[PDB]
Amino acid sequence: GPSFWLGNETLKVPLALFALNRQRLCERLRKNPAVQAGSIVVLQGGEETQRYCTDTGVLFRQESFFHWAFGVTEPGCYGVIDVDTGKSTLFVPRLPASHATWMGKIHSKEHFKEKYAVDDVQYVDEIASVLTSQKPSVLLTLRGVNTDSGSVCREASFDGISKFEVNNTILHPEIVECRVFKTDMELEVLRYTNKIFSEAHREVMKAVKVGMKEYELESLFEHYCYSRGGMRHSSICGSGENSAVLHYGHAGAPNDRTIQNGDMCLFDMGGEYYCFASDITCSFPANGKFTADQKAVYEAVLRSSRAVMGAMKPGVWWPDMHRLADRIHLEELAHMGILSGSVDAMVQAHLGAVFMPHGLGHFLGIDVHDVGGYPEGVERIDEPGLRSLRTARHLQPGMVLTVEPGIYFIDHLLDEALADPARASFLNREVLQRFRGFGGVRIEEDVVVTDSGIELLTCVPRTVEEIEACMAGCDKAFTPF
């Protein structure tokens, strides 16, 4: 069957991946007792956009649910699936003659049918007529709340849809649940995105020199992933104190610090291949040699990383892993002399959240922060740190998670803790003072839950010895200029 491919050494992704997803969605819907026979799932693809009132185009990236179901890269499409038969129909725009001059060849419907391995292709302007001829009981459309953004999914609409019976409640939780569990075909893509990002991280570690701007390394990473991996979307490079800023690198903070001798670097890179994401973070000394303090903090996060990975298997409650990481960080910070006292009491006082204010990790898939973390019946825990978890679910096979503990020295959180007598007694101010401005360390792996444990997708140097050896290497193997 056909595949998506960007040539060279990039991955061939079979269009069968999307056919399987369509089948899985139908199977799940057929089991839902509220679903009427003759129902048709209706999804609307993304459209091309421009910057404000200008004609400057914005890079088109397909909407994630639509991509999951169809793998279609073209703007302006819709896609429908007959629930009872699984039959798929793609609707493509009927394009003007002038498209041939400006945009490219005008493909036939048959070309798209072959390309996407769908059962039928029609033009978008005929969607009402085509759906009418099929005499559906109900159109199932997508509407629900994303629990990371709080946004409501945009429901499909077309001229004449008001003449149909439309349900916008059933679909969302079902398609979300399908997305939560990755098929073997999806896992092949995620292994590939991890391979490329892992190689690109190694290249950054080999290339970093004191005196460079953070964005110079961002640029190199993106160049590797695009030119060698076909990862066009490679869109957090934080040195020194910036490593404590959790989403550093936005327009408010555009990666323009000069990397200095003595800095810790935290390079968190997210990107995608054919709308399949990966998200990997490496931390390393800018000058290639960990100091004693850097080694201590780094190895504390290595410890929690590997303890969590070693504990993960089906039935494990993700908030328990978050609390495990907190406890280990507190133990290690006490060994370093930053903290003193009973670690049990530190945990009761939520001291771990002072050093790791974000969630331990999140579902990963078509979105970097993937859907389904908080389905109905799964509640967010209203405690420091835990409230930032992007899922409070128990692990099951096929889930793909980031595992991303970190320790940071964040002045406003440290200062709050020092003002609070329940927490201040644990903090040794004179030792802590030396770590003001340290920034932070985060170690982020992508893993898949298996029947008995996990499969680690990421492959980057991780021990102090491995990282120092990587950075000291002479073989960059790719020098642009």
Give the binding site for Cl ion (CB under 5 A). 429, 432-433
322 binds ligand PRO per the rule CB under 6 A: no
Given ligand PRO, Na ion, Cl ion, none, residue 427, with its beta carbon under 5 to 8 Å by kind, binds Na ion
* Residue 358 interacts with ligand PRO (CB under 6 A): yes or no: yes
**Residue positions forming the annotated binding site for a dipeptide:** 247, 279, 369, 390
Virtual torsion, Cα 68, 74, 76, 81, nearest 10 deg: -40
186 makes contact with Mn ion (CB under 5 A): no
Residues 326-345 within binding reach of a copy of itself (CB under 8 A): none
Write out the binding residues for ligand [O-], residues 244-303 only, by CB under 6 A: 268, 279, 281
Q: Residue 295: left (phi > 0), alpha (psi -120 to 50), or beta?
A: alpha
Shortest distance, CB of residue 443 to ligand [O-], whole angstroms?
Answer: 10
54 binds, among ligand [O-], Cl ion, a copy of itself, none (CB under 5 to 8 A by kind): a copy of itself
Dihedral sign of CA atoms 330, 332, 333, 337 in order = positive
- Is 356 a binding residue for Na ion by CB under 5 A? The answer is no
Q: Nearest approach, Cβ of 174 to a copy of itself (angstroms)?
A: 16
Using the rule CB under 6 A, which residue among 285, 359, 440, 461 binds ligand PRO? Answer: 359
Residue 427 engages Na ion in binding (rule: CB under 5 A):
yes
Q: Which residues are annotated as a binding site?
A: 247, 268, 279, 362, 369, 390, 404, 444
CB-based contacts of 348: which residues, under 8 Å, 6+ apart?
none
- x/- letters, 223..252, toward ligand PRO (CB under 6 A): -----------------------x------
Q: Which residues contact 183 (CB under 8 A, 6 or more apart)?
A: 17, 20, 21, 24, 398
Give CA–CA dist 268/404, Å, rounded: 10
d(CA 286, CA 310): 29
Out of 223, 295, 303, 306, the only residue in the binding site for a copy of itself (CB under 8 A) is 223
The Cβ of residue 19 has, within 10 Å, a number of other Cβ atoms equal to 21
Which of ligand [O-], ligand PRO, Cl ion, none interacts with 359 (beta carbon under 5 to 8 A by kind)? ligand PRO
Let me know the angle formed at the C-alpha of 305 by 357 and 288, rounded to the nearest 5 degrees: 95
Helix (H/G/I), strand (E/B), else coil: 339 = strand
- Amino acid at residue number 20: L
Which residues lie closer than 8 Å to 386 by C-beta, 6 or more apart?
319, 322, 323, 353, 359, 392
The angle that helices 464-472 and 292-311 make with each other, rounded to 10 degrees, is 120
Question: Which among Mn ion, ligand [O-], ligand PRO, none contacts residue 82 (Cβ within 5 to 8 A by kind)?
Answer: none
Residues within window 403-422 making contact with ligand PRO, judged by CB under 6 A = 404
Residues that bind ligand PRO in the complex, under the rule CB under 6 A: 246, 268, 358-359, 362, 390, 404
